[PDB]
Design a protein around this motif. Structure first.
Motif, mmCIF file in Angstrom:
data_model
loop_
_atom_site.group_PDB
_atom_site.id
_atom_site.type_symbol
_atom_site.label_atom_id
_atom_site.label_comp_id
_atom_site.label_asym_id
_atom_site.label_seq_id
_atom_site.Cartn_x
_atom_site.Cartn_y
_atom_site.Cartn_z
ATOM 1 N N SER A 1 0.825 -1.199 0.000
ATOM 2 C CA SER A 1 0.000 0.000 0.000
ATOM 3 C C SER A 1 0.868 1.262 0.000
ATOM 4 C CB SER A 1 -0.962 -0.004 1.187
ATOM 5 O OG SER A 1 -0.247 -0.071 2.406
ATOM 6 N N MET A 2 1.973 1.250 0.748
ATOM 7 C CA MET A 2 2.883 2.399 0.801
ATOM 8 C C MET A 2 3.399 2.722 -0.605
ATOM 9 S SD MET A 2 4.634 4.448 3.205
ATOM 10 C CE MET A 2 4.531 3.414 4.657
ATOM 11 N N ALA A 3 3.743 1.680 -1.351
ATOM 12 C CA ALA A 3 4.278 1.829 -2.703
ATOM 13 C C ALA A 3 3.257 2.352 -3.706
ATOM 14 C CB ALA A 3 4.857 0.499 -3.190
ATOM 15 N N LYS A 4 1.985 2.255 -3.359
ATOM 16 C CA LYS A 4 0.933 2.678 -4.266
ATOM 17 C C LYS A 4 0.518 4.150 -4.102
ATOM 18 C CE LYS A 4 -2.577 0.289 -4.163
ATOM 19 N NZ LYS A 4 -3.712 -0.615 -3.805
ATOM 20 N N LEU A 5 1.025 4.811 -3.069
ATOM 21 C CA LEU A 5 0.670 6.207 -2.855
ATOM 22 C C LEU A 5 1.279 7.121 -3.918
ATOM 23 C CD1 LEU A 5 1.183 6.347 1.050
ATOM 24 C CD2 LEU A 5 -0.949 5.966 -0.261
ATOM 25 N N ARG A 6 0.605 8.232 -4.188
ATOM 26 C CA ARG A 6 1.135 9.212 -5.119
ATOM 27 C C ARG A 6 1.928 10.267 -4.363
ATOM 28 N NH1 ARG A 6 -4.183 10.662 -8.601
ATOM 29 N NH2 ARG A 6 -5.266 9.216 -7.182
ATOM 30 N N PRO A 7 2.967 10.800 -5.001
ATOM 31 C CA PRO A 7 3.773 11.902 -4.465
ATOM 32 C C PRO A 7 2.870 13.060 -4.060
ATOM 33 C CG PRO A 7 4.735 11.092 -6.490
ATOM 34 C CD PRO A 7 3.456 10.329 -6.308
ATOM 35 N N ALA A 8 3.039 13.559 -2.840
ATOM 36 C CA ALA A 8 2.141 14.554 -2.287
ATOM 37 C C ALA A 8 2.560 15.988 -2.623
ATOM 38 C CB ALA A 8 2.015 14.372 -0.758
ATOM 39 N N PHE A 9 3.802 16.172 -3.078
ATOM 40 C CA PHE A 9 4.361 17.517 -3.261
ATOM 41 C C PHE A 9 4.968 17.785 -4.647
ATOM 42 C CE2 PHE A 9 4.662 16.313 1.242
ATOM 43 C CZ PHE A 9 3.917 17.333 1.826
#
Ligand SMILES: CC(C)(COP(=O)(O)OP(=O)(O)OC[C@H]1O[C@@H](n2cnc3c(N)ncnc32)[C@H](O)[C@@H]1OP(=O)(O)O)[C@@H](O)C(=O)NCCC(=O)NCCS
Ligand SMILES: CC(C)(COP(=O)(O)OP(=O)(O)OC[C@H]1O[C@@H](n2cnc3c(N)ncnc32)[C@H](O)[C@@H]1OP(=O)(O)O)[C@@H](O)C(=O)NCCC(=O)NCCS
Ligand SMILES: [Cl-]
Ligand SMILES: [Cl-]
Ligand SMILES: [Cl-]
Ligand code: NA
Ligand code: NA
Ligand code: NA
Lengths: 389, 389, 389, 389
Positions: B224-232
């Motif tokens: 799940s961590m690897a699936k997050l999109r860059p926030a900035f």
């Protein structure tokens, strides 16, 4: 063992006046540059900047750091803001002195800055309000001027003190007129020139140089003062006229060890001999200077009668008179160039403001022993003893 | 010389979670009472309360004094707030130590408190907006999380570091998962019970006792961590997952001289042996812990290898990894019970939060030498060295 | 079948000037009470009050009704508002005719009113912004000046017309300057005295009497005009001197039939034979007054040359030069005393405003047929057919 | 002499629900093109689009044109919005009918649209807020729900009528429950299908087709409605149960001369035979339909007993119960399919809503002479009689 090598302040602006659109950190940067220049100290030598500031909402991360960076203090130095209400700008100097005393820093610039004009209105809107009006809260009133325990304005605490020390409206007004007339006289004679560093307000329609305390009323009359309405109580005695104002300004001091000043060939404005802060009942916060001054003098080893000059903050005529009556110092050595009723009171800067006024007057008249003190919302006082070198 | 007699912190609340409607000073009051009770010290013996707090807009006059008063600390003591951003809660402890060191106080409660949930939106509306749109500004983002010089979020400084030290998204994610799993293990094992004081959240239809760090994810997966999109940054590596959270909490320590503790028969959590603060480039503020930790160790006369336990703040995986690489301390002794990625980061409380975690773990395992350090927006670091008695 | 028996209008106030605090309905109220005793009908014989208004937000329930009930019109009567933007003020009078035409009313009070000065900023806030800034939108700009299809100011569409008709910066400034000269001339010669009704702006510390358009500048020189900068386009031609202003004011007319008036010995001010409205490309809304002004004639059986008087909205010198460079009617009889560049343009009121001049003029100079037209945002135009007896 | 060719409305939505984030005009967009295609008339035959709307703040220039355009109405066509509060959507219809009676148009789409959900909060800040707390309003409450003369909510004027007509808490429940019964009934049956045109709520993360009224409650009893606490007076009688909701929707109809529909071979829902409007005591705005419906009834040369079907808006049970008891029409043929309290009353649309319920029902069962009536804020009424051959 810690001296004030130099000091400077901006003129104090009127509410929404000269500095109506000038963020506090800009005023602060100018005073930092000034204390450096006045001491012959380069910005690269500064270790830390410590600036009292009560109302920084909306100004961005850590305005103290913004002010320091703008003034050219190196990225390797540090900076931080603090808040002990009207005591802030003086407390910051004590805190700065302590950095040097504990050997954690060599050169500190310390004081306060405030833009009450720029303080925003606010509301907590993350929860939600899906129907009907909500309150936008004046942060200046809420976070600066309202007691958090009783819910009322500092001005009510002034009434509490007036009633308690039985100070008439006439005595309050006489004091206020006297502060204005002292401040007008000092301004006309040039006594604020030394302490004031000019501030350039940048504008599209032109730059303006501000170097005069604009809040001081010229030709203050007892008659107009007597006609004012009480501002906090229908049957009260405290008025816009015998209360300090809402104002913008900044003020600071460059600190270093006495030994360090000597190596540099600096003639300092004074030695920090002692300081104290003490609490009192929030309902009579204006009385805080009494125990704080007594505590500072005890620590200095000084009697009240030993003092040659005093700056005692004038938040309201009521408490200023209370403080003078209780301490019993010669009123003629107190605020000899006027006080906050005439000059103004940018909260976070105030304590450094009166320190500046004290230092430069001590130097001009050759006073040996001085004391600066302020009252503090929520029931406190702070005071500092200074001795000429 | 100066010891931490006792410590306590609230559980750390999730953004708009358990403490969503709880003012910072309420959290602070609970921790003040806790340190008193844990040390067997009465509130009347307290001289001053010093509380870091970055976001006090709208909470009313000097929330530090509000917390102190709520806790039953006498009106005669004093209190103030300070702001060195994320460094605040730790800087406050050093500042309290200096009060005792210079002989100005005997008993200090110091730490930080923050309600990021309660931070308001704001706008400067005094000069009136003649025409055109204007923003209501989120004070949490603007005053706590945005760099004042470059105008971007702390998360962009995190990318700057990731780029500079060539830290891959995979390395940052592994670090983040590792933080979560350590925190989860420590929470389940009971390792946060000693430091946490429970907080009762008052409510119309029921009071709720909060005594667990509610931000800690249970069962966090690398997938799940690897699936997050860059926030900035669209082409970034920093995400909600490998960044610390927005959070609410308070944390504090009770300070007195070693001699005072001995007089009372107190067994202190540790001796403050040194502290330091140093600036770095704002673009890479996450690196602040390197020169600050190095300076604190120099002052203590310690080598990096002398340390038995370290709490190095986890504002972002990118910077925490950078700090670790550069300092080169055994990562097995750093944040042994997890860090802010898992536990959360209420800005002004964070430094005291990680100090609590350090002290109680040092006591638990019998570690003799510890160090706490945090990065600071605007390009600073702070660190403190502690030794067991 | 229908006639206009009397007309009246407020002076036009500049942005945030004489009526900066004056609600629209107040100005409407004065405007009704003016027209209402001008014919011999008491307020108690008014059927409905139809007022054009574009920025009603925050002024309270159905303002048309507030302005009537206050004007003195009885509660048994009825009132509503409408919004064809800059066309509302005249469409309103037209709407008025249909009532007495369809045989559903006898006496109608109809026109426009606007305090752009009082138009609030807004934000949809039912969600409860979780984090991040949100915009406070200037309703005046958003709902009154911005194209809902292309998102740019009306001023941009003035550039579209300019580029379209090849109207050099010179010819626009030449139209503009002409306006200020004619407006300043008519004012001095008191040709605005008949129509204008005094409005008393109530004040805490004394009342002021506003009986003069404060937006006309004392004879703009073709030279002072050539100074200004492009207002909407970096390399444009539309300036703040050849474009319309932002204004507050009100204006209307009493409407009634022929035979009924005959019974009451009432003398009209003009007859109503027909009216028209038509839409164009929103990107060139300024062309609106061309099809509208052409279809009106048809239903009147009159040829373009039958008209003896014309008022044509000067929203912009660009759209103005084009409206005239097409329709062909006697150029020198357009805006006998100016229109909007010099006089002002409170949106909703505009139509009835430019109408008042027309109506009364047809009665003072004595002409069979007259007309007024205006441009409308979203690409439209509107006009009526009047025939004094 | 003029007929409704076709009629369409949207699904009535709950406050902050089905159309929580959908703009008025996007609701007016499918409604117009719903009637158009139902009539078999090309949008390019549209003369004008008249839509009532009370809460348009922040939606942009003239949203009535935004609806036409989005529904494919040619730029050449015309459109405007208007406001007669709770009677905007029916007064539109007559204003529509009157566009043709005078011969100024042949085809009008007239109706009402309202997204109470999207109505923003606002304040006048152009002049500024020098010092102290202030209010952001609500526009829905302040501009759509509160009296401008006495300053109280519709829920209080409904209270006035209760006591005035000795309406107990039971006599008000019975109506709300009996109308909450016939709404659930008429729903399952599907008598709403025809008049509803489905609205597609675009969902980036889940597209959803709203095709039913979501303010209708399932299983209403006199039991739940009785356990309610007065919402406008501690000891009141008006509750959330016996009063209309806050809602979003849009509704309209296609008007053309009966001759023009003959040429087009269209079956017209009805035939507008009489309309009216007049004001009643503001304290009792609910008493608007009593005199209103009476003019409707006389103008048409119809006895009350001539009617077959009546749609009187149940904004509150207090007013309606007097609409019936005072007027005369047999209560067994008034809102057989239920009313507002159950369905909903999106101010500006509500008048076009009840009509669409009127038409399709007269059709379904066979009603010749039917009447629709609404109360209006400010103390006005509006009614329209519709017979079909
Ligand atoms: C007292 C206070 C509320 C007054 O603010 P205010 O209500 O806006 O009052 P103003 O400054 O506008 O003064 C009102 C009038 O008094 C007049 N006035 C003030 N001082 C006067 C004097 N010495 N002589 C004659 N007139 C005077 C002003 O000219 C003004 O006139 P105006 O109404 O024609 O403009 C405000 O200055 C305040 O809160 N001060 C408190 C400072 C403080 O609490 N500091 C920290 C405490 S620890
Ligand atoms: C990083 C930040 C912007 C994230 O804000 P956000 O994305 O709007 O809010 P969240 O982090 O809670 O949401 C992130 C999403 O990722 C998910 N997520 C977060 N951590 C996760 C994990 N470990 N595993 C799986 N999913 C996760 C959340 O469930 C949420 O999912 P959703 O949008 O599909 O519902 C915010 O926490 C922040 O600003 N942190 C700043 C810390 C900082 O700057 N410190 C300064 C040092 S000086
Ligand atoms: Cl662990
Ligand atoms: Cl709004
Ligand atoms: Cl009304
Ligand atoms: Na009138
Ligand atoms: Na207006
Ligand atoms: Na009734």
């Amino acid at each position: 063992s810690i001296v004030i090598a130099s000091a400077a302040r901006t003129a104090v602006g009127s509410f929404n006046g000269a500095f109506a659109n000038t963020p506090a950190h800009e005023l602060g940067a100018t005073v930092i540059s000034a204390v450096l220049e006045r001491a012959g100290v380069a910005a690269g030598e500064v270790n830390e900047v410590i600036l009292g500031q009560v109302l920084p909402a909306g100004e961005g991360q850590n305005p103290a750091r913004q002010a320091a960076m703008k003034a050219g203090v190196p990225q390797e130095a540090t900076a931080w803001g603090m808040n002990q209400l009207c005591g802030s700008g003086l407390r910051a100097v004590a805190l700065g002195m302590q950095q040097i005393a504990t050997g954690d820093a060599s050169i500190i610039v310390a004081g306060g800055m405030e833009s009450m004009s720029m303080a925003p209105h606010c509301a907590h809107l993350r929860g939600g309000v899906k129907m009907g009006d909500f309150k936008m809260i004046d942060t200046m009133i809420k976070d600066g001027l309202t007691d958090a325990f009783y819910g009322y304005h500092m001005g009510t605490t002034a009434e509490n003190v007036a009633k308690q020390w039985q100070l008439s409206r006439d005595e309050q007004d006489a004091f206020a007129v006297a502060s204005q007339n002292k401040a007008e006289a000092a301004q006309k004679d040039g006594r604020f020139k030394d302490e004031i560093v000019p501030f350039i307000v940048k504008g599209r329609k032109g730059d303006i140089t501000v170097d005069a305390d604009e809040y001081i009323r010229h030709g203050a009359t007892l008659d107009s003062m007597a006609k004012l309405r009480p501002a906090f109580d229908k049957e009260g005695t405290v008025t816009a006229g015998n209360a300090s104002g809402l104002n913008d300004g900044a003020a600071a001091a460059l600190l270093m060890s006495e030994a360090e000043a000597s190596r540099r060939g600096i003639q300092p404005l004074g030695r920090i001999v002692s300081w104290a802060t003490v609490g009192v009942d929030p309902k009579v916060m204006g009385t805080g200077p009494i125990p704080a001054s007594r505590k500072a003098l005890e620590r200095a080893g000084w009697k009240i009668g030993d003092l040659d000059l005093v700056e005692a903050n004038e938040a309201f005529a009521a408490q200023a008179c209370a403080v003078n009556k209780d301490l019993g110092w010669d009123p003629s050595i107190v605020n000899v160039n006027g006080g906050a009723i005439a000059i103004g009171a940018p909260i976070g800067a105030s304590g450094a403001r009166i320190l500046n006024t004290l230092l430069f007057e001590m130097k001009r008249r050759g006073a040996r022993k001085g004391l600066a003190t302020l009252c503090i919302g929520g029931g406190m006082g702070v005071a500092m003893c200074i001795e000429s070198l």
